[PDB]
A paper describes a structure:
Organic Cation Transporter 1 (OCT1), a member of this family primarily localized on the basolateral membrane of hepatocytes, is involved in the uptake of cationic molecules for hepatic metabolism and excretion. Here, we present cryo-EM structures of full-length human OCT1 in the inward-open conformation, both ligand-free and drug-bound, indicating the basis for its broad substrate recognition. The structures also show a large extracellular domain (ECD) between TMs 1 and 2 unique to the SLC22 family.
The 6 + 6 TM bundles of our OCT1 cryo-EM structures are arranged in an inward-open conformation with the central substrate cavity accessible to the cytoplasm. We also observed additional density that likely corresponded to the first glycan sugars on residues N71, N96, and N112. We did also observe weak cryo-EM density in the binding site of OCT1-apo at low thresholds (σ < 9). Although we were unable to determine the identity of this material, we hypothesize this may be a buffer component or an endogenous cationic ligand, or the average of multiple different chemical species, consistent with the well-established ability of OCT1 to bind a variety of ligands. Upon examination of E386 and D474, both residues were engaged in salt-bridge interactions with R439 and K214, respectively, as well as an ordered hydrogen-bonding network with surrounding residues.
Numbering used by the authors: 19 to 279, 331 to 515
Write the structure that this text describes.
Amino acid sequence: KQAFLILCLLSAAFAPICVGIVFLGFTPDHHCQSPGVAELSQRCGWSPAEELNYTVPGLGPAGEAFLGQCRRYEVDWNQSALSCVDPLASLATNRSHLPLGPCQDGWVYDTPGSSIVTEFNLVCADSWKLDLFQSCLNAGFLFGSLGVGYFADRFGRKLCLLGTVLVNAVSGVLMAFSPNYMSMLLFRLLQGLVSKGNWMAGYTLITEFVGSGSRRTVAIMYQMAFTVGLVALTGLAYALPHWRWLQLAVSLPTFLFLLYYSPSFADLFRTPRLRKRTFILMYLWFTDSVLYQGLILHMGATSGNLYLDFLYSALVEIPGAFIALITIDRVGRIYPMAMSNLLAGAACLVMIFISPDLHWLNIIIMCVGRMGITIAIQMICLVNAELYPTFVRNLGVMVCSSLCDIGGIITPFIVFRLREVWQALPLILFAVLGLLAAGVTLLLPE
């Protein structure tokens, strides 16, 4: 089936675009660079962990790593007479009396590889600019969803798809050669504009060519090709430790695909029943998008062994798919989706209380939440279709699914900023959103 495998290749290659930020933008441990410190450390012979104890401001109470990460002692390390046992001890009764300055010379990053964070110095006061890398992508998705389908209706469908695939490949390759952060953000926007349109076009063609007897099965194979793409990403991110190398490796396969070759907006709100259904479907699409992206970003930000945690988290999407497929036939849709929302809400709630050393439990609860949101996302793709009649379904699917893009725009600032107010607070949001999405589902008909 030559035509099937190539669209499954087009579905697999989408996953690195959505989730690759986990590997391209990791933050290692850092502290200010200081002159003379290296020379003194060589003369006195400090070991690598001892140099910190003598040189970098301590954590103190409540962690407060800020004083080590973003400040330095204004001490004349060129002084020859300093004690090789503890050089600061002569200067004041307590190190807290010393003057602090900012990292005027730069940061020292403890990593053998590299990331956009380490190259553009997206730390301390600039640390909010990492959130804009994912927000620009989701904004591009939002504009693409409204524009590209109309362009494909005005222009020829085949030439349109061929053009947007050539533009997606070329923009993905050029981003690896980005000379600065601005250009990288413009390539990330131009890639966002086309990626999701291509993915939806391929899905449309695959379910249109295939008959109604197998549409659900080919849809589930299309979603499983995304999981295969995630496992390939996981393996390449392991063998290629540099971000530009991984961006090239991820981009080049797309060139091989090229080488192989009336409704009206007012209707959705005109009646209170259709309004109710529309607002509920909008809310569930929003909630599930926010939770799916939020849990992956939280795991990337917080896991201590990201490679195996990402591998085990990805594989669990296979039983989730088979369970959804069987449940659709045996049971229904309202109660299975309520239960799968409630399960992810409860897993997010329990994760607040787990002791940080119970990692072997923490991964189990993370996998249970992942499987829950996977089953719920699979269910809503069916429920969203039959609640709208065919006269409006082509529009109504676009309308309700667009909330996924505003959720993706908002999510990065929640995970990265709000965590600095209090580290539990994002999980409290995810718990409340999931436990409200559980109850609201029961108000839909069946």
